[PDB]
Amino acid sequence: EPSDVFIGLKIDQITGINQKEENFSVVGSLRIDWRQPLLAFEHAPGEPKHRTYTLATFLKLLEEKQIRWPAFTYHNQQGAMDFQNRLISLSEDGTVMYLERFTSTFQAPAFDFRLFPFDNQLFFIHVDSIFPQHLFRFQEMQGFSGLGDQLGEEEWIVTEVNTHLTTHNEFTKGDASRFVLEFHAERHLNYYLMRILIPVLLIITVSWFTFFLQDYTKRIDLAGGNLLLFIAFNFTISSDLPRLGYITLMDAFLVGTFIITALVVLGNVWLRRLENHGQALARKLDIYAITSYPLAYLLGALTLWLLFF
Amino acid sequence: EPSDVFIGLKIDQITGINQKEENFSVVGSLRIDWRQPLLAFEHAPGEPKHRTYTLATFLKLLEEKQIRWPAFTYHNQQGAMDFQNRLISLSEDGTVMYLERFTSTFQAPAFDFRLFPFDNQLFFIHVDSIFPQHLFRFQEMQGFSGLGDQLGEEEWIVTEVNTHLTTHNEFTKGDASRFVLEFHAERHLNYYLMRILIPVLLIITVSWFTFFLQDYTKRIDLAGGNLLLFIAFNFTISSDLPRLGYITLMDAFLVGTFIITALVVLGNVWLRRLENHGQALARKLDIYAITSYPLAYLLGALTLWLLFF
Amino acid sequence: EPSDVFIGLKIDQITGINQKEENFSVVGSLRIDWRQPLLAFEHAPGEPKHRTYTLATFLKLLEEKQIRWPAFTYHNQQGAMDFQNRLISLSEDGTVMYLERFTSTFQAPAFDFRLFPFDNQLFFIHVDSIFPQHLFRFQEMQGFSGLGDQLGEEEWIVTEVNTHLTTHNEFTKGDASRFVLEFHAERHLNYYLMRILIPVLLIITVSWFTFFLQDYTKRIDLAGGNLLLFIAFNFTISSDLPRLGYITLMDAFLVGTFIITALVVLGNVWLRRLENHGQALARKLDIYAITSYPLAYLLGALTLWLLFF
Amino acid sequence: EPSDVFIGLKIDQITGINQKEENFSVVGSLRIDWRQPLLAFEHAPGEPKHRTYTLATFLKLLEEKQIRWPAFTYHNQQGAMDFQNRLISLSEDGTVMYLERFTSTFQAPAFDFRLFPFDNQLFFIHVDSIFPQHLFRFQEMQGFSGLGDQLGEEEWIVTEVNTHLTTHNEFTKGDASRFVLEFHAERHLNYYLMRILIPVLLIITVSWFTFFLQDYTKRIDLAGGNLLLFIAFNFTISSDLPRLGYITLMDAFLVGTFIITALVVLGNVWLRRLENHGQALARKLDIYAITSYPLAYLLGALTLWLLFF
Amino acid sequence: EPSDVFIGLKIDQITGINQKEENFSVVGSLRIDWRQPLLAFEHAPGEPKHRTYTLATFLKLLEEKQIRWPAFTYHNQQGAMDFQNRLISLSEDGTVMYLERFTSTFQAPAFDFRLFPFDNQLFFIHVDSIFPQHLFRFQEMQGFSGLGDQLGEEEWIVTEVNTHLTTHNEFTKGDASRFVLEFHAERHLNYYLMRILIPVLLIITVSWFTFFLQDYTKRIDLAGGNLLLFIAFNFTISSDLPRLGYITLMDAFLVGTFIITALVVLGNVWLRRLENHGQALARKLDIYAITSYPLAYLLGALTLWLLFF
Ligand SMILES: CCCCCCCCCO[C@@H]1O[C@H](CO)[C@@H](O)[C@H](O)[C@H]1O
Ligand SMILES: CCCCCCCCCO[C@@H]1O[C@H](CO)[C@@H](O)[C@H](O)[C@H]1O
Ligand SMILES: CCCCCCCCCO[C@@H]1O[C@H](CO)[C@@H](O)[C@H](O)[C@H]1O
Ligand SMILES: CCCCCCCCCO[C@@H]1O[C@H](CO)[C@@H](O)[C@H](O)[C@H]1O
Ligand SMILES: CCCCCCCCCO[C@@H]1O[C@H](CO)[C@@H](O)[C@H](O)[C@H]1O
Structure with a gap:
């Protein structure tokens, strides 16, 4: 037995x-x-x-x-x-x-x-x-x-x-x-909130404040540098995890900020190209540039939140 | 027994x-x-x-x-x-x-x-x-x-x-x-004084010296870069501690410098927007910009010191 | 036995x-x-x-x-x-x-x-x-x-x-x-795609968007900084591998981006030197500068892909 | 026995x-x-x-x-x-x-x-x-x-x-x-001479060369950036030692370079403020700015050398 | 026995x-x-x-x-x-x-x-x-x-x-x-060639290309930043070796690039000072500035190669 x-x-x-x-x-x-x-x-x-x-x-x-x-x-x-x-x-x-x-x-x-x-x-x-x-x-x-x-x-x-x-x-x-x-x-979540979410959100929000200065060149230089900052945060995140064969919610979030920032550079290059190709127009186009930025990030946020929930 | x-x-x-x-x-x-x-x-x-x-x-x-x-x-x-x-x-x-x-x-x-x-x-x-x-x-x-x-x-x-x-x-x-x-x-406290407090205080003080140059664009660029420096110090601090579920006095101190720097960018964008919307005014607004900066940091310091003591 | x-x-x-x-x-x-x-x-x-x-x-x-x-x-x-x-x-x-x-x-x-x-x-x-x-x-x-x-x-x-x-x-x-x-x-390949390919491709694509702004000086400064970014990615890659005595496909890829970026700086210095040495010309030369960039990276891509496959 | x-x-x-x-x-x-x-x-x-x-x-x-x-x-x-x-x-x-x-x-x-x-x-x-x-x-x-x-x-x-x-x-x-x-x-001392003294001395000496260009704005931006470089060297040094409760000769040396650089920013802001408040004056003030820089670093060097020897 | x-x-x-x-x-x-x-x-x-x-x-x-x-x-x-x-x-x-x-x-x-x-x-x-x-x-x-x-x-x-x-x-x-x-x-030697020699040589060569743009200020800013890059490479090298009491061929090579870059800043400050102290002169001095750069690095290279071989 x-x-x-x-x-x-x-x-x-x-x-x-x-x-x-x-x-x-x-x-x-x-x-x-x-x-x-x-x-x-x-x-x-x-x-x-x-x-x-x-x-x-x-x-x-x-x-x-x-x-x-x-x-x-x-x-x-x-x-x-x-x-x-x-x-x-x-x-x-x-x-x-x-x-x-x-x-x-x-x-x-x-x-x-x-x-x-x-x-x-x-x-x-x-x-x-x-x-x-x-x-x-x-x-x-x-x-x-x-x-x-x-x-x-x-x-x-x-x-x-x-x-x-x-x-x-x-x-x-x-x-x-x-x-x-x-x-x-x-x-x-405290670490991620304090070291990743708050900084990324600040960079995006304070960068938008400068749109109210009405300088297209300065905006393109700002979004360009922001893109490099996100590439840097992308490496900060990758160091916490193994070299996975699948996409993380965090990965999607960073790739999202890249895509929007890439499009912000594209949009503002395009709007400056429109100014150059034809005063009240200048200030009319400016409204699109300023309202584009929050809508693009709010559209991106809704995309991930749908794709993961 | x-x-x-x-x-x-x-x-x-x-x-x-x-x-x-x-x-x-x-x-x-x-x-x-x-x-x-x-x-x-x-x-x-x-x-x-x-x-x-x-x-x-x-x-x-x-x-x-x-x-x-x-x-x-x-x-x-x-x-x-x-x-x-x-x-x-x-x-x-x-x-x-x-x-x-x-x-x-x-x-x-x-x-x-x-x-x-x-x-x-x-x-x-x-x-x-x-x-x-x-x-x-x-x-x-x-x-x-x-x-x-x-x-x-x-x-x-x-x-x-x-x-x-x-x-x-x-x-x-x-x-x-x-x-x-x-x-x-x-x-x-010697390490924290020498490597964190003195540098953070210097960056803030010497950045304020440049307000006396009277260039609104240069100020916005200075506060923007300062914000990135604090984000970097935020990572320097996070490396010393575990990924806690609670806020540190140090954490509050860094989040504090973010909030003030974010508001400095916001304020100086706003003051430049006021100049643009209407000489003696220019130099009158300048006084607010120059005296805002020390008051904002002194108000932040009194907020943490109250919240933790 | x-x-x-x-x-x-x-x-x-x-x-x-x-x-x-x-x-x-x-x-x-x-x-x-x-x-x-x-x-x-x-x-x-x-x-x-x-x-x-x-x-x-x-x-x-x-x-x-x-x-x-x-x-x-x-x-x-x-x-x-x-x-x-x-x-x-x-x-x-x-x-x-x-x-x-x-x-x-x-x-x-x-x-x-x-x-x-x-x-x-x-x-x-x-x-x-x-x-x-x-x-x-x-x-x-x-x-x-x-x-x-x-x-x-x-x-x-x-x-x-x-x-x-x-x-x-x-x-x-x-x-x-x-x-x-x-x-x-x-x-x-997920890690390499997310942290190396996508960022390198973004830096190259969004940098090209700014050519449509028509500022030769800004282009030279952009390619110069891009070269430094690739030198940094070169160190990021070298840290993953031993100090080999042979060239990697990754190594060839990074050396490739250096060579093209070096030539972009050379070409745009040359095109600005042509402007200076003789309006319709200005805008004619600009077409070469804008179409050079994608052709140079597409020529580089065909070179490695041939040399390794 | x-x-x-x-x-x-x-x-x-x-x-x-x-x-x-x-x-x-x-x-x-x-x-x-x-x-x-x-x-x-x-x-x-x-x-x-x-x-x-x-x-x-x-x-x-x-x-x-x-x-x-x-x-x-x-x-x-x-x-x-x-x-x-x-x-x-x-x-x-x-x-x-x-x-x-x-x-x-x-x-x-x-x-x-x-x-x-x-x-x-x-x-x-x-x-x-x-x-x-x-x-x-x-x-x-x-x-x-x-x-x-x-x-x-x-x-x-x-x-x-x-x-x-x-x-x-x-x-x-x-x-x-x-x-x-x-x-x-x-x-x-070879490591400290090659990696800390020579670089710090070069940054200070070549930065002084640019004073002969006669641009007050460029000087303020140069000293500001130099201050950040020293803050970075300060972290490089701190990594070699324990988090001591006392000041090192090295610590005093770095705190010294901060104080002088802070005063260089202060002085050049002040001299630019004097230009603005009243041609031969411009070029007379310039002499103070150019001779201030070496005297400030030579005064700092005498202070540490006395305080430690 | x-x-x-x-x-x-x-x-x-x-x-x-x-x-x-x-x-x-x-x-x-x-x-x-x-x-x-x-x-x-x-x-x-x-x-x-x-x-x-x-x-x-x-x-x-x-x-x-x-x-x-x-x-x-x-x-x-x-x-x-x-x-x-x-x-x-x-x-x-x-x-x-x-x-x-x-x-x-x-x-x-x-x-x-x-x-x-x-x-x-x-x-x-x-x-x-x-x-x-x-x-x-x-x-x-x-x-x-x-x-x-x-x-x-x-x-x-x-x-x-x-x-x-x-x-x-x-x-x-x-x-x-x-x-x-x-x-x-x-x-x-592959690692040193790919990660140290090629990048250092590229930085020097592509930096020289911009001399043909004919902007003295831009040159001084370029050599200044290059000096910081070499200070950074100096730390990259120091991390591979012990804190030796003697000079390496690599050490001499980096100290060499510092000295030449320091002199490039000095030379271009001096040439701009000559322009300011007296059109055909401007363009005559420019030739010295452009031909100085390659001669200085070629003189440095011959100095180390003699001192070590
Ligand atoms: C950084 C976000 C802050 C937004 C407020 C605008 C003020 C300027 C901030 O500094 C700038 O930031 C760019 C992007 O990071 C860099 O390309 C640039 O070299 C740097 O001077
Ligand atoms: C930054 C603390 C030193 C302040 C002294 C003023 C002189 C300029 C220092 O360089 C500044 O560095 C920031 C951070 O990178 C940039 O955002 C900013 O555009 C740039 O002007
Ligand atoms: C980084 C590529 C993003 C392309 C979008 C164009 C806006 C400008 C981005 O900032 C660039 O960053 C480099 C960093 O090294 C600097 O050297 C360069 O002078 C600066 O203009
Ligand atoms: C910097 C040490 C070398 C000085 C030689 C003079 C040429 C300019 C060097 O570029 C400087 O680089 C800093 C990086 O932090 C910036 O903040 C600063 O505005 C910029 O002028
Ligand atoms: C970097 C070598 C590339 C040479 C081609 C010139 C294009 C501009 C590249 O950006 C440069 O980066 C340096 C280092 O940060 C700064 O000192 C400099 O002022 C800045 O213009």
Whole structure:
């Protein structure tokens, strides 16, 4: 018959979410409860009812006793897992109580940047049994699993946490146990508002103020320089994300400001060309130039907002 | 009954405070005194009264003797703890004297940037007993704990150090011992004064000098370029901090310079529009333009200083 | 006679491809099946038919039994290989079943940037037997080897995966077994289109719009500044690649924009010099200046497209 | 009575001095000679007179023989100490000969940037005995300690090396031995001359050349832009140093160029305002403007040179 | 008498050459052949003639047998040496066959940047015997040592490889064996040509084209801005190299462009001052201004080329 292995995983800290590399890093405690009757022992009066072991000698004890332990893997782990504690407490009964305190990076393959920076992402940790379900079956260790109260993450905000069990077929032909700790997190928009939206909007608004000066040459030079500023913001954004094969809401927004600014240069070159090809006309054309600018940006804003919502 | 475990923690060095990642790094010595009568030994005349052990063989001796050691965790530790010394001295009595010299990063979840750069922060180290208070009770090892005299931190200045004991319920249902080393540190303002305040103030003051040249076009071009410079300083500041969900005193200060500069462009466009819509007037309007500038910045400065103090 | 060693390698994750350093990083599982009759054992009823060992004690068992294991090396590995699992399952028969879960960087020496960013690259992992083919022969472990379904790579797209066996002569004079896991990957052009092509094309197109303003001085200043922008893009590109000894398609493209922009400055200086050396002429010369610009870029485009295709 | 422990430390390489983090990194060999009569042995003819041990088994031999070794700590060490060799050679006499080859970062808390880049710094390595002077006394191992002949440091130049012994009271109430390897190093000014002094001086000198063009507006625009360039150099310098709480000679130098440039803008605005408020006057005022510039920078240079020397 | 230790070192990969830190990184295989008659063993018919050992148990076997192994150090190694394989094969004879597969950084103290980027550098690996020549003598293991055929280095190109033996006196008074693997490598100029020479030459050439426009003010503004561009290229170069105490050919080249550009500003200010102090003169002076520019750069080019060749 298969022995129940009680898996518990608790994330104490989120040391960071690296969206460029699509991974996240946590400080966590893994807890396992497993009754192996073969490991049971008799004790004399005064001798302890609970034997405490360093994982190293406990595994050496299992090999001696010819017992198979529920060998597991953190399926989505990346790099080195720095350990803090790897402790076993064995009861007279044969109940193994294991605690694994670690710091580790995990793959975040659920990353969908299509609505960035208004995106919500899924992060998970996969704990797999190397041995199949006929030998060991993972069960949910009750009242332990989840996320702590001092995670230390400032940009992201965890919306919900879930735990479930599923099968995997990584090394075996038959199904094998898999414990899942899943969490959803959305972004704090403050950075994007302060460093990207407000500056881009200011550049556009204060640039429009200068149309009231009535100098066509100055306008063309202003829109030309604005175009270079947006090209620069385009690089600022690209540095936050991986070199995706798809368009972001942010990408569409920047490409949008390029297209409008390109057309502002085109329009004002065209209006100056009309002045040159024929006083009351001059001031009549000026009205189009001044009212074109806000209408072009308001038309662009309605285009993205429709294309993404 | 529970055995007293004497915890002592001394921070020799502050290898750095990383405010972007909200963690800090220290070189520290952990000292433990624990009397276990079961570990007592008899010695012959001339044979040593104190046995010195490498942690590895000492733990192997405890497992042999079926003794439970006060297994502890640095609760707020992050990543790898690089060890220098892990030495045990066991007296004839059974008094275990442990020394743990390490370099490690620790989570700084008490980070409040709301008044940055005039902020004071709390940094702590949590040492938790894995076993509950019925088995082991942490006591304060007197005359050891604290912070050294060559911490090597240049930006920060430690205001006070404290040590206290508390309970935690991390792995157990019953209360478990927790030793706390807390320290408060405030910032040296010299960097911010030299690299941010003085430059921003100079750009504003020397830009005002040019108003006395009496060219409205040149003023609009000056404020426009100044706006771009502040957008650039805005990115310089954002790189020091995490992508917070809240507004900083620094953030308010930069958004403030944007708003005033935006209004300077607006005002000077408006004053040039007034000149155009009707000599003594010209020079009368000029007085408003020249006196507007200092009043706008002095009004902005009074707004933030009120909003934050 | 030589014993068959069954090699299986599966890449679960592509943690990244670093083209500047010409290496790649993976999370992978190595699986080995090897029958050693000497390791066979007899068991009593109830005693397990499969013995599970930590690599450490299994190798200690081989040394004891004076047995030689199929010592292997990942020939193209770089730096530290962080291990997750190193587990042995030994059957009554003497069939050793080994699993090696690791994270590691590997040399990518097949990097050909000649057609970058339209390039396709070869990535491989070499598993070599230290002992020659007369002792051990590598065989392909069927139904395991390949690449997973959640690799997590966003810029690159895997076109095909292959496994084959070959000989090597690294440490021996006689041939020795080598297992190869090869994969081809092409690039997602979206980043290059959004951040390099569209901006460069916009700068060129909107700059041409201003020729219709009919100011020769303004044109020379525009082309001069455009040249500096391309010099800046030239540095942006150079940061993505190693300091190659050969010319890239991208390199040719940027050198191309330099040459045309240099000639635009030369041509417009020449046309202004013609105006100065002799009204209907002025406007006749203007036609050449305006039609020169698109023809020069269309001539350049045809030159690279011919030189590379 | 106390046993003499002979400490020898030789720095083979200076892998770098990181002034921003106030630490330095070395490749070094630690050598210890210690006679423990208890470790003495008898040998048969043909059997070796010197027993060679890996530190691991030598410490296991000491624990067996119940001997206390002179446990030491590198007091100012930071992070991980990567070891190359840890070898023991035990003579028939009981003379332990230990060699420790390592790569490690050490705290440089003696960093005084007040006269940077004309600064001289003190770097040291502290080797402390964990046990007090009544048990073990550190002595200077003659003819070994110092700094090698291929250190590999290019910016810094070692002026002198010293070795001495002192007491410490880190873990004990009674004095404990401390071995000190100290070295002084001064900086090669070439980088600062080529990248900071020459450019700043050129910008100032070639900007003065344009005063001979006799355009007041052009001068104000030139000094304004120069001010921005110095603000940029100010950030270039700040990146080399920690965020100190004190003013550097370099800091004073840059603040100096700001103040003079601010006054150049002020003066030329004032002189243009004098022209406007009343031909031979014009050309008379021009002389003040042209001779002001060199006198202002020569007055600034005399101010810093007095304030720091 | 002394026992011959056969050293073989083969570099499989050059993971990089870091010229800023003056070190290089390799993947290499170290091979040792050493006959120790004391390690010889007798075997029964059918029992193996070759015993295979993990370094750990082989060293434990040497300590047991009271044998001294040829303890060695990679003298110029830096940081951690990540190992792949550490395997021993012991023949009936007592012939120890050792293989050490590693990834490691090594000090490159032979770095001479005086002719950069036209420089050729020496890179080496030093393998030293800890024990002197009376105990162990290093010999060249024939047909193994050298550099592989898939080094993966793109900027550098290996000109020649050499192996030799020498003495050292690092830990001993008497001479001790040292094995040396040396290689010379020169640089691929393509990066410097594409990113530094072509842009600098273009800026100079296209700037000269505008002299034919005949505007003295525009020329002074052009040379002024060019000076700032070169100051920027000066920082781009400085980032590639350490903060050397000597002048590079590249450094001389950039300082050269500063001096000429400074003189171009000086000359054109002077020529405009001559126009102002006295039509056919105007156009006569113009010839000097236009022909000065190419002569000044051609004179500068001949100065460096003479000073360095
Ligand atoms: C920058 C947006 C500010 C709008 C208000 C108009 C004042 C002028 C701002 O400066 C100008 O900005 C252009 C575009 O960025 C540059 O081409 C130009 O060289 C620079 O002098
Ligand atoms: C900018 C702070 C210094 C103010 C002193 C006045 C002299 C001119 C300085 O150059 C100015 O730089 C801005 C930013 O690039 C441009 O927008 C502006 O058109 C330009 O005139
Ligand atoms: C940038 C191309 C945009 C084309 C639209 C025409 C308006 C002017 C854009 O500003 C230009 O920016 C360059 C930046 O280097 C300067 O050198 C150049 O003198 C300036 O005129
Ligand atoms: C700038 C140092 C070299 C001085 C030599 C005189 C020629 C003009 C150089 O161009 C200057 O470039 C600055 C860039 O910031 C502008 O602000 C300023 O208005 C402009 O005149
Ligand atoms: C840049 C070299 C190109 C040569 C061809 C002349 C066209 C004008 C290019 O813009 C120039 O950029 C310089 C650097 O910022 C400024 O100093 C200068 O006043 C400005 O006119």
